[PDB]
Design a protein around this nucleic acid. Structure first.
Lengths: 367, 165, 366, 366, 177
DNA sequence: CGCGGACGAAGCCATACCATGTGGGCTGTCGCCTGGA
DNA sequence: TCCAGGCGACAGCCCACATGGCATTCCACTTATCACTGGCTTCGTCCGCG
RNA sequence: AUGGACCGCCAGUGAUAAGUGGAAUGCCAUGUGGGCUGUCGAGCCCCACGCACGUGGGG
């Protein structure tokens, strides 16, 4: 009930997700530096793709007061009645003197101090519960320091509204641990299979209008960049996912679309100026019934180069899957697709013809 | 730790007079930014990270523009003095100092020449001696010297700022 | 009578169990920092796995009053009769007024100061002894300050009910030193075989619904992570384990499942954001009849890199096991499995084919 | 006639014997802090192992009245007759009103104030001497303040009954200076060879059952641990040991088993959760005929690291033993075993093959 | 002499953490660590201009500034409600009023007072954050200057916290007649 | 029978809440070769 | 023999970013243990030794 | 040769048994490094042959 997915994807000279100063994130694995792509980045691209197709819109935000007030102004409420209304809806949960909120701003609707994660119909329904108490909201707004008047039970029941992205990726809310759902997909960081140093790109910004006595450009900097063959992995705890979704068919659709989004997508970080759109050179899905397992140790010993890295990484992943398969014997299902027909990878299962076919047959075998 | 500073000082004066005097060895040491180093700075070196700390800054010395070529605070003070006086942007040199102070040994020699040359293009005074003992000290303890640079920078920047009013 | 188990397991860029400030726990070994995984974490993951299979459910908790009250509400008692009942079961032990209880919550059974560790049938049976004295409990609730009325002998004998996790890991209870059981498994902390510094990972939480069309994001931070090749070790004192379990057949099942859970499991600390699930690249079980032995000193001199660490760590553990074997001669059994067919590890015994096979042949030899 | 033994043993991240607050005991040597293991802890582990093999059970206790009464109840005496009997055995040995006792807590037999150190057959024989005067003891219990009736000469001769652990470690008894036996083994504290600071582990025992709204740990705290390469040393005065034991074969067996237990054993302080069992990486036995000598001054200048400490400690002990040997020349015997074949330690004597071989050849040469 | 700088820092940091999050987040990530650790390379911007001119003094400033920025929002919302005591007095006011465990606080106080310059910085942050978890009014300037004088002798700052703690405990108990 | 060694006999005992400020001492360097003084 | 010069030719300039964001709750344990020995005074007698 | 000379406070000791820091997270949106260029006589010694212009051999 653990769907493991491995994939070797070689990214050209680009910068997927930079650090806090421009440089690309790097790991120190097996003694050598290795550029890496954070897990949250791919998880975000994946979610936007999955929910993109399955138009669920699992909006993550802070300014819920602003949009609840926006829905209330669309449904007839006045500006102040809407603002005080939304602030009452968020403040009417009353754990510890109501919800915790940031220092109020001059005139805009303040943003809660905790990031919510709800679908859009949830916001609409919150505005509905707010609209059902018009008189009550006005009556509290007439005071100077109002309190909660909303039925914290049902609004608290609206915050528990899950979603495909909520089910897979999970949610956290400290002030309301009753709505906290645990994630079902273990997403790992993507590190290179070979040590790569960063290359300093010197770029200049030229001004298209000339003055005499100078030819200086509009700007001068050095953006860091790096290329390499990234290794990626993810696990899907089927049991817990079917628990979150409840049904088994919706769960099957969510895992199938998840896997297709995991292979398909590529982040949008510094991609407009360095097109790095690519496809994984190796895709290996395995269905394990005891515990998920990653092939990261295969890539601890860094690979020296001057040659290619796709073939060496593929066949070396093969060897590690072979010995690992004969050291932790288990009755599991294995399948893999590959964009190179030179070698034949035996230990990776039965070579399917294409990525979507592989995903379909593996999700099918996983029920 | 001063035993490296004095040698570095002799090297900086001899190299300064040598670059303004003889253009041949100037352009020959500038090409590295390395046999020329083996024949020029080798007699001023007593861990190879120290030796590279000498010839690397020697090349940076020979690569500076003429305006700043014909002319004790560390590099942090130098950057603060450049930012306040000569209009450099604070939010940019701060980001550059963090960028340099976070890297390892092989990183500072890669991101340092451009910034040192750029601040030098405004006739800023870099006590090259201590810069050589700093890049030498980068091997013994990296985060300690980086700390000195960042905290020294902010310290003298706000001290001079409040001192100006 | 000492089942020793060693294992080299290389964990990728992750954070198994953070410290009280986010960073991973680190040792200062051989002069260099070395990230480590505390023993309590692996022991917790292991037990949850063993009791998972062996559905014994060795619940560790404080709120026993609340759950006993839950059992009494399931069995017909009223809310107040259940609460006062459970408090009577707890207050009728200890050589003083009762076991130390302090500051209750608001509308809910208080929490004992000490920590209990019992199986689920034990709690149920506690509710049973409480159920046999309905009238007594009701009579005591009528007063203002009730006292103990329950037969401390049998409830105290129910608190002594052991379990697989209780047998292996042991229990402590100050108010009842008669129920304190001593552990039989020595579990060691897992330190890297090479000095590793922490890696700061700047991260951001983008927020939808833009207010100013700015690229301003709801939240920023920097979480500490670290990777490396951890060394792990554990001992199983057969003698004391057979004493706790009593039988010799139950003990064999507990030790076999212990070793398999020790290799299989990995904690659940910051895994949803970094899948650090892995298997040990080297497993060495040894059966010693005189004293347990650890290979920690072999990894004191940190290993410098730029190369791999799996092969170097494996062959170095081999060398240390060989010279150590020829310096402390002993009649022991040795076997090992390995996920690398490059080198030949002689001193580690006879290379079995797989982890479960090695475990079967070694538990058998025990 | 002095068997000196030196040993370098590196203990991993652990806490052998904590202080009165959890922290590990530390010395301030050569200016720097150094975690240490007290001498009495190792001495206790050693004795329990030696007596373990040589099943002598040199029980050190206070409740001699309780066990003498138990022995008398096994042999037919009534509970009160046994209690009063034992109290007669203890009350008939001091100057008057017997040895000093403590306030009786329960109706249970009281505990004497001093610590006795006897083997189990000694207690048995004491119960025998008490049984030889059944009627007399019963007659004394009839009074209100009884006195001594036992033949203090033979019971005093029974308290002087030695043992292997009594012979080596010695005994003290203030109220009976006639039974005081002097120890024959000088055991030294074990301090690290490099300055080590303590490090805090943050642990949270979490409760297994969830609470209605929130979920927090059951208890959070932090224990102090430390790792390092300890130096250990001990002396065995053969002359006085053969004097205490009397024979030379029993003495030879006692010293051989002492050395083997000294290398083998490791304390039991928080080992159930750290698995810090290890062996000395270097063992140096020397037999000197003039005076015992320790190598502590060699390790005064603390060692800086980032590298290993085993090799540096080994070669530095070598250096100090070499120059020290050429400054205090003497015709002594030197032998050593080592778990690291990189360097060759010349000054330590002739490299035997293994620890038990080294001990056998050195005890033989003595 | 140092107390004055201490009051400066406590002033602008006490208003800084509540008035803008950038510095509170750059300082929060520096609790209990060395002034040169890369993770704290973002805190110099705010703290570096106030240290005067030994490392014990800077350790004191950075460590306690971080402590002031890592306290929970409850403790800051009460910290911003609007001779003098050490933190020992704070511990006694915490046990006597807010019901902490006496026998525990006593052994944690003697545990911390019995350590070296580095043990007070590793054990201190969780202790003070626990005290601010119970919202006891702790004085920061005295805490830092104390840590500053903690480096010349481990006797002149410990003994006064222990004796001051017990003194104020028995005065709070004798005053409860 | 003659006697060693060890103890014991007391005199003695003891109604007109607050504090601490300190430090300072060690180290060696080059560019080499021809010409002229 | 020692001080001093020298040692083909090796580029100049100009420009260097603006903004926005930095989270919350909770948990902090128990009990048992804490030694004796003495540094006074003379003599007579008493139990044990030879 | 000093209110001193001679002069041991001292023989015995596990601090012990128990413990997840845990759940959540795009660092992002924008950039010419540029204008200019042929790589074409002092040297230290020996010997040989020499048209006293030099040529070759061994150091």
């Amino acid at each position: 009930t653990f769907v493991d997915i491995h994939a070797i994807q070689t990214l050209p000279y680009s910068n997927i997700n930079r650090d806090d100063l421009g440089s690309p994130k790097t790991v120190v694995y097996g003694g050598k530096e290795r550029t890496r792509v954070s897990s949250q980045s791919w998880k975000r691209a994946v979610r936007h793709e999955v929910e993109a197709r399955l138009g669920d819109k699992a909006v993550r935000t802070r300014r819920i007061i602003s949009e609840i007030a926006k829905r209330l102004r669309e449904r007839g409420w006045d500006a102040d009645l809407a603002d005080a209304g939304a602030r009452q809806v968020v403040l009417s949960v009353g754990k510890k003197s109501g919800i915790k909120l940031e220092k109020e701003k001059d005139s805009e609707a303040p943003a809660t101090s905790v990031l919510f994660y709800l679908p859009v119909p949830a916001i609409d329904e919150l505005a509905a519960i707010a609209d059902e108490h018009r008189d009550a909201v006005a009556k509290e707004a007439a005071k100077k320091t109002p309190k909660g008047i909303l039925p914290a039970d049902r609004i608290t029941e609206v915050l528990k509204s899950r979603n495909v992205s909520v089910n897979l990726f999970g949610r956290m809310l400290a002030e309301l641990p009753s709505t906290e759902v645990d994630g079902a997909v273990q997403f790992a960081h993507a590190f290179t299979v070979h040590g790569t140093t960063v290359e300093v790109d010197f770029f200049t910004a030229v001004d298209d209008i000339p003055k005499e006595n100078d030819h200086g450009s509009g700007h001068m900097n050095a953006g860091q960049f790096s290329a390499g063959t990234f290794y990626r992995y993810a696990n899907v705890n089927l049991d817990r996912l079917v628990e979150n979704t409840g049904d088994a068919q919706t769960a099957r659709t969510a895992v199938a679309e998840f896997l297709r989004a995991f292979l398909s997508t590529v982040p949008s970080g510094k991609q407009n100026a360095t097109a790095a759109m690519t496809l994984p050179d190796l895709v290996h899905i395995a269905v394990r019934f005891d515990r998920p397992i990653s092939f990261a140790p295969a890539f601890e010993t860094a690979l020296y180069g001057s040659d290619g890295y796709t073939l060496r990484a593929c066949q070396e992943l093969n060897n590690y899957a072979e010995r690992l398969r004969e050291v932790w014997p288990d009755d599991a299902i294995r399948g893999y697709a590959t964009v190179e027909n030179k070698t034949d990878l035996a230990a990776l299962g039965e070579r399917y013809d294409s990525y979507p076919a592989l995903i379909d047959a593996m999700v099918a075998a996983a029920f | 730790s001063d035993y490296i500073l004095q040698h570095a000082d002799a090297l900086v004066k001899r190299v300064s007079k040598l670059i303004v005097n003889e253009p041949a060895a100037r352009a020959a040491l500038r090409r590295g930014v390395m046999l020329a180093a083996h024949r020029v700075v080798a007699p001023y070196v007593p861990v190879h990270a120290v030796e590279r700390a000498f010839y690397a800054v020697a090349a940076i010395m020979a690569a500076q523009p003429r305006s700043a070529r014909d002319q004790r605070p560390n590099l942090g003070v130098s950057l603060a003095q450049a930012v306040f006086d000569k209009g450099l942007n604070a939010d940019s040199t701060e980001q550059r100092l963090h960028l340099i102070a976070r890297q390892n040994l092989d990183g500072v020699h890669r991101h340092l020449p451009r910034l040192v040359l750029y601040l030098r293009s405004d006739q800023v005074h870099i006590d090259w001696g201590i810069l050589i003992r700093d890049l030498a000290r980068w091997g013994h303890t990296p985060r300690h010297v980086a700390r000195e640079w960042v905290q020294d920078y902010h310290r003298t920047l706000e001290t001079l700022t409040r001192q100006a009013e």
